[PDB]
Write a protein that binds this DNA or RNA. Structure first.
Ligand SMILES: [Zn+2]
Length: 240
RNA sequence: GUGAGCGGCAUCCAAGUUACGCAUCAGAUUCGAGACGCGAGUAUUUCCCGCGCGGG
């Protein structure tokens, strides 16, 4: 899998819609997934409407949308892929905290896309870049493009465990917000400020925003136990 | 063509109501406007201070 639109024909196996124009000009990328639209490929002109708030994330100004993206842009597809992890095998739901911990500590090997909506409904799937290697996971949370490294997540979890192994009252070394919205997101808490060594503080201050967002779900007083998410592509196909 | 470019934390809200610086406490005890200015002592030079003259 190479493009976000590749999930349609590879895990949803949906044939293209009808009434679609056929490109008969010089190739140009899809305005959504940057996929080339060569001669003979089925496309459709852009008709996003006045409620499209993702003009900044458009891959190109070609005003053309491939059929895979047209399938992806359906309301049933948007709602189904709000908290979805699309691997080669199928589509899983990472909405639960345990699923997030499993994904960010024991990721699947194959290429996969990670989606997470920050609101009721958002355009995600055609914006998420593919994660080619599980060591450098690219996560699209709403409008933010996050890079999550599972090794850094594990190291931060170990740092917290060493910090709070003895004290009965568990305290978060770093202030984290699940929405990545608080003005104190990523700042060191007091307990971590005078209970962590210089190296651990330096490591905590030098984590990517995506790692802070992930730890905002995985790092708590009682760490969630990782579990495999349930397959969802059947539900999405049935509702489509 | 710096994962760039583009993007109002913004709108609305009474610190207010009620409350005695007040009650009590000698500026008192002693003592004169009534006393204080020379009619006090001889005759012509003696030791001396400034130097004929000032002066013990
Ligand atoms: Zn596309």
């Amino acid at each position: 899998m190479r493009y976000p639109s590749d999930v349609v024909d590879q895990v949803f196996k949906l044939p293209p819609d009808k009434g679609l124009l056929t490109w008969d000009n010089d190739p140009v990328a899809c305005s959504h997934c940057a996929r080339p639209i060569e001669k003979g490929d089925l496309y459709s002109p852009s008709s996003v409407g006045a409620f499209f708030s993702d003009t900044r994330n458009l891959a190109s100004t070609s005003r053309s949308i491939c059929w895979r993206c047209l399938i992806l842009r359906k309301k049933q597809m948007l709602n189904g892929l709000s908290y979805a992890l699309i691997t080669q095998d199928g589509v899983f739901q990472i909405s639960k905290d345990t699923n997030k911990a499993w994904l960010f500590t024991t990721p699947p090997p194959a290429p996969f896309f990670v989606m997470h909506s920050s609101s009721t409904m958002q355009h995600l799937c055609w914006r998420t870049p593919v994660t080619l290697d599980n060591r450098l996971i690219k996560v699209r949370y709403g409008n933010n493009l996050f890079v999550v490294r599972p090794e850094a997540i594990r190291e931060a979890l170990e740092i917290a465990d060493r910090m709070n192994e003895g004290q009965k009252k568990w305290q978060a070394p770093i202030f984290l917000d699940r929405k990545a919205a608080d003005s104190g997101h990523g700042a060191l808490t007091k307990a971590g400020r005078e209970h962590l060594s210089a190296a651990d503080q330096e490591f905590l201050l030098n984590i990517t925003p995506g790692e802070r967002w992930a730890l905002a779900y995985i790092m708590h007083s009682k760490r969630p136990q990782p579990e495999e998410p349930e397959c969802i592509t059947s539900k999405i196909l049935e509702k489509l």
